[PDB]
Every structure is written in structure tokens, then in C-alpha cells.
Amino acid sequence: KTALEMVQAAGTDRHCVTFVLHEEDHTLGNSLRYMIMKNPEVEFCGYTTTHPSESKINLRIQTRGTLPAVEPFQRGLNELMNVCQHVLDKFEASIKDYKDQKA
Template sequence: MAAGAERKPVLEMVQANGSDDSCVTFVLHEEDHTLGNALRYMIMKNPEVDFCGYSITHPSESKINFRIQARSTYTRP
């Protein structure tokens, strides 16, 4: 990497204004279905998770939008 060049973040957390903490979207850069499907499978094993899914924005981009929605009674550790 060239000196002074900025690195893109690997993971970003995106949350709509006014939404509660039970639903959040993550953006994973430089990833594809390999990580997305495995991560979705493992997260859905948690009984407190109502929904977990991902989408790839465009085939030419290596970026995943990953959404998790937990029960409203669940609080983050």
C-alpha cells in the first residue's frame, strides 16, 4: 500500500435515524456469498434473532449489506 493512502473500513454499521437497537445493518467490504451465507447461518442459530439476511449490492462490487433483527426484549451485552 502506498504511503499516505487511506484504507477503507472492513466493516461499517448503518442504522436509520429513529430506529431502535434491535435492528441494525452492517456493510462488509471485500466479501461475498462465502462469508455472508456462513455468517447468516450461525447468527440464525441464536433464538433471540428474529431475522438475519444479506444481499450483495451488485455483482461487480465486493460488498455485502448484512441485516440483523433481534427480539425487542434482547439487549446487547
Template structure:
């Protein structure tokens, strides 16, 4: 948790230990369906992307869990 006066990160990358190298989850803070759906649409246009989706953890939180799965290694 950020201390008082510190800025909270807008974007975090979450990678499970021993997880698939072509799959990663990002956490976007202070965002909602407007960015989530638009970003998902544009990323799915990429040929190497197998899956892209997002969830909003709870309606009272403005945070998105955004998951991308690609064919092969990471492309970011």
C-alpha cells in the first residue's frame, strides 16, 4: 500500500511463479470498461494474440485485471 503522499502505480504487471511465458496479467488502476473494452478490441487484432480479456474485480473498485496470452514469448 502506498504511504501518504506517495502516488499509487497506474499499471502493475503480475506474473505467476513458473507461469507460462506467453501469458501475463496487468492491473490497471483507476480505469473501467471504457478503456478495458477498447484495449481488448485493439489487442485482439494482433495476429500473435490467442486470448485477451479483462475483469473488473468489484463494482466499487476502479481497477481492471487485464490478461493477454500470446503464441510464444512476450511481445511487450
């Protein structure tokens, strides 16, 4: 039950949705905000911690047009995973190369 999506209004307009992410902090939210704010379609993306005591972040994505907002959020998570995969491979290759020169 980590992700609960709350639509802005009773009409359930898809363009504005707030994703409440449980067991989360600034580390996932700030990194995700940068990845999902590099999308041209997302007009507004921001994260807010409801209280310091509760470990939940509310992320609000407001899209430019008819995009449901699940699609921008999902694309941002996919991009963050790819950025992590590239950094891990590049870091490991560089570390191995350094040890070899030392030897």
C-alpha cells in the first residue's frame, strides 16, 4: 500500500494527481522530481513532507494537457533506474581500471 494516488477533484481529472509515497524521504522525492521535471509535458511537479514525524512524501504532478500523470510519473521512475544502472557500471569499470594501474 506504498503508493496511494489522490485525484485533485471529485471529477477525478487525470491531469492533476497527488501520489502519496509511504516510507519515503527527500532522497527519492528530490531525485524523482528532477527526472520528472525534465519532461516537457509536466507543468508543475513538487514534493511536500506532511510532517517530519510521518515518513510519507506527497508528490503532485500537474500535466500540460490530457496526459493522465501516471505516465509522466512512471517515465520518471524508469529514467532514474537507467541513470543508476549507467553510473554503477561506469563507477565499477573506473574502480577496476584504477586498481590495475596501481598493480
